[PDB]
C-alpha cells in the first residue's frame, strides 16, 4: 500500500462496552476523515457483540490518523484500542496486530465451521 505493507482502509477497535453499535462508532471515527462502512461481530452465547469491531474508511492516510487519535482513548466511559488489523478478503500481513486477528479476520472473511467447511 501507499503508506505500509497492507491497505490502511480497514482497522479494528476494541474494550467497548456491549452498547457500542456501528452507529456510535461511525460518530467516534468520522472526524478524522469520511467512512466508508462498519462492522460488528456476534458471539453465539449471548447474541452480542464481544466489545470490539471494524471500522472501514475511503481514504487511508486519515484512517491512519484514527488510529493514532483513538489508541488507548476512551469511549463509552472506559479505555478502548485501535488498530490496523489484516484487511478483509485476504488472508496475509507482516505488521499485524498482537492479538487473535489470525482467527477471527478469518472467521469473518473465511466464514466460520459451523456450516461450512
Given at each position: 500500500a501507499g503508506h505500509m505493507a497492507t491497505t490502511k482502509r480497514v482497522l479494528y477497535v476494541g474494550?467497548?462496552?456491549?452498547?457500542?453499535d456501528d452507529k456510535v462508532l461511525h460518530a467516534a471515527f468520522i472526524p478524522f476523515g469520511d467512512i466508508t462502512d462498519i462492522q460488528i461481530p456476534l458471539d453465539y452465547?449471548?447474541?452480542?457483540?464481544?466489545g470490539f469491531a471494524f471500522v472501514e474508511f475511503e481514504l487511508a492516510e486519515d484512517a491512519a490518523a484514527a488510529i493514532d487519535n483513538m489508541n488507548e482513548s476512551e469511549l463509552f466511559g472506559r479505555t478502548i484500542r485501535v488498530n490496523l488489523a489484516k484487511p478483509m478478503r485476504i488472508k496475509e500481513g507482516s505488521?499485524?496486530?498482537?492479538?487473535?486477528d489470525d482467527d477471527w479476520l478469518k472467521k469473518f472473511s473465511?466464514?466460520?465451521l459451523e456450516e461450512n467447511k
Open positions: 474494550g467497548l462496552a456491549e452498547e457500542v452465547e449471548t447474541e452480542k457483540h464481544r505488521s499485524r496486530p498482537v492479538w487473535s473465511g466464514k466460520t
